[PDB]
Design a protein around this motif. Sequence first.
Motif, PDB file in Angstrom:
ATOM      1  N   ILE A 129       0.841  -1.185   0.000  1.00 57.99           N
ATOM      2  CA  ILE A 129       0.000   0.000   0.000  1.00 57.99           C
ATOM      3  C   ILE A 129       0.886   1.248   0.000  1.00 57.99           C
ATOM      4  O   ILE A 129       1.844   1.335   0.767  1.00 57.99           O
ATOM      5  CB  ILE A 129      -0.994  -0.048   1.162  1.00 57.99           C
ATOM      6  N   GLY A 130       0.534   2.185  -0.869  1.00 54.21           N
ATOM      7  CA  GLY A 130       1.285   3.424  -0.979  1.00 54.21           C
ATOM      8  C   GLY A 130       2.252   3.375  -2.164  1.00 54.21           C
ATOM      9  O   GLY A 130       2.481   4.388  -2.824  1.00 54.21           O
ATOM     10  N   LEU A 131       2.793   2.188  -2.397  1.00 57.06           N
ATOM     11  CA  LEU A 131       3.729   1.995  -3.491  1.00 57.06           C
ATOM     12  C   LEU A 131       2.955   1.870  -4.804  1.00 57.06           C
ATOM     13  O   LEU A 131       3.178   2.640  -5.737  1.00 57.06           O
ATOM     14  CB  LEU A 131       4.650   0.807  -3.204  1.00 57.06           C
ATOM     15  N   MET A 132       2.061   0.892  -4.835  1.00 56.92           N
ATOM     16  CA  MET A 132       1.252   0.656  -6.019  1.00 56.92           C
ATOM     17  C   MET A 132       0.129   1.690  -6.131  1.00 56.92           C
ATOM     18  O   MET A 132       0.225   2.634  -6.913  1.00 56.92           O
ATOM     19  CB  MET A 132       0.648  -0.748  -5.953  1.00 56.92           C
TER      20      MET A 132
END
Length: 11
Positions: free
Chosen positions: A8-11
Amino acid sequence: GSNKGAIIGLM
């Protein structure tokens, strides 16, 4: 890192 931040946050 229980996925959080990465899964979460990356993608």
